[PDB]
Structure 1
Amino acid sequence: FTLIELMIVIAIVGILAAVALPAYQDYTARAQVSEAILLAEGQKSAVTEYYLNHGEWPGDNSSAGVATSADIKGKYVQSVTVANGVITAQMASSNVNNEIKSKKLSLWAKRQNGSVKWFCGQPVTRTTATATDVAAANGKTDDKINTKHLPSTCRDDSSAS
Structure 2
Amino acid sequence: FTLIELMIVIAIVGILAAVALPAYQDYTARAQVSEAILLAEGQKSAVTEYYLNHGKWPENNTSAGVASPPSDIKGKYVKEVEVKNGVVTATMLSSGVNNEIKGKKLSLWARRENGSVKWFCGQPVTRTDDDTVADAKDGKEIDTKHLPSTCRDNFDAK
Query: What range is the shorter-chain TM-score in?
Result: 0.7 to 0.9
Q: Secondary structure at the match of 1:56?
A: coil
Distance between the aligned counterparts of 1:158 and 1:32, measured in 2?
23
Instruction: Say which structure is richer in strand.
Output: 2
Tell me the equivalent position of 1:85.
86
Q: For residues 55-111 of structure 1, what are the alpha-carbon distances to aligned partners after superposition, in whole Å with 9 as ceiling and x for unaligned? A: 111122133232242221121111111121111111111111121111211110112
Distance between the aligned counterparts of 2:27 and 2:109, measured in 1?
25
Deviates more, 1:151-160 or 1:92-101: 151-160
Q: Does 1:36 align with 2:36?
A: yes
Show the 5 A alignment for 1:60-79: 60-68=60-68, 69-79=70-80
Distance between the aligned counterparts of 1:42 and 1:91, measured in 2?
16
Give the direction of change, closer, same or farther, for the CA distance of 1:23–1:82 in structure 2 (3 Å limit). Answer: same
Give the direction of change, closer, same or farther, for the CA distance of 1:117–1:38 in structure 2 (3 Å limit). Answer: same
Q: Does 1:139 align with 2:138?
A: yes
Q: TM-score, normalized by length of structure 2?
A: 0.82
Instruction: Say which structure is richer in helix.
Output: 2
Tell me the equivalent position of 1:152.
149
Tell me the equivalent position of 1:107.
108
| Contact 2:92/2:101 (<8 A) preserved | yes
Distance between the aligned counterparts of 1:14 and 1:34, measured in 2?
31
Kindly state the Cα deviation for residue 139 of structure 1 after the two structures are TM-superposed. Answer: 2.7
Q: Secondary structure at the match of 2:90?
A: strand
Distance between the aligned counterparts of 2:58 and 2:142, measured in 1?
24
Kindly state the Cα deviation for residue 120 of structure 1 after the two structures are TM-superposed. Answer: 1.5
Gaps spanning 5+ residues in structure 1: where? 1-5
Letter matched to residue 138 of structure 2: G
Distance between the aligned counterparts of 1:148 and 1:97, measured in 2?
13
Identity over aligned pairs, percent: 70
Give the direction of change, closer, same or farther, for the CA distance of 1:15–1:40 in structure 2 (3 Å limit). Answer: closer
Query: Highest relative contact order (Cα 8 Å, sep 6+), 1 or 2?
Result: 1
Q: For residues 106-150 of structure 1, what are the alpha-carbon distances to aligned partners after superposition, in whole Å with 9 as ceiling and x for unaligned? A: 11011226622111111112113xx0321211232x2x1111111
| Contact 1:57/1:132 (<8 A) preserved | no
Give the direction of change, closer, same or farther, for the CA distance of 1:115–1:97 in structure 2 (3 Å limit). Answer: same
Distance between the aligned counterparts of 1:74 and 1:120, measured in 2?
19
